[PDB]
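#dry-run=false #mode=assembly
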Amino acid sequence: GSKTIKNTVSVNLELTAEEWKKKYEKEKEKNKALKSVIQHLEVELNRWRNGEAV
Amino acid sequence: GSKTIKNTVSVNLELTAEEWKKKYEKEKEKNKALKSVIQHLEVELNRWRNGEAV
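#status=ok
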């Protein structure tokens, strides 16, 4: 302990999934909503191609 | 401890974001690429409607 200057500090281990869970949770919503959009836009051409009613 | 048969086991808590991160990472790529496609196909009609050059 004697004759010691500045103590070495180790880097953080693993980040808590608490943050990963929240980000992922909302993250899935974005992609999920986007997925529906993909089908939505693709549907547009499919229904507008023949002008299908409803 | 005496007179004990079969030990009760609790269910897993929360899954590690390690797996959620990898799946989400690639997941975003799929939706991201699909998003570009949506605009791509929608662009098609927009540019082909007037036969815009380039």
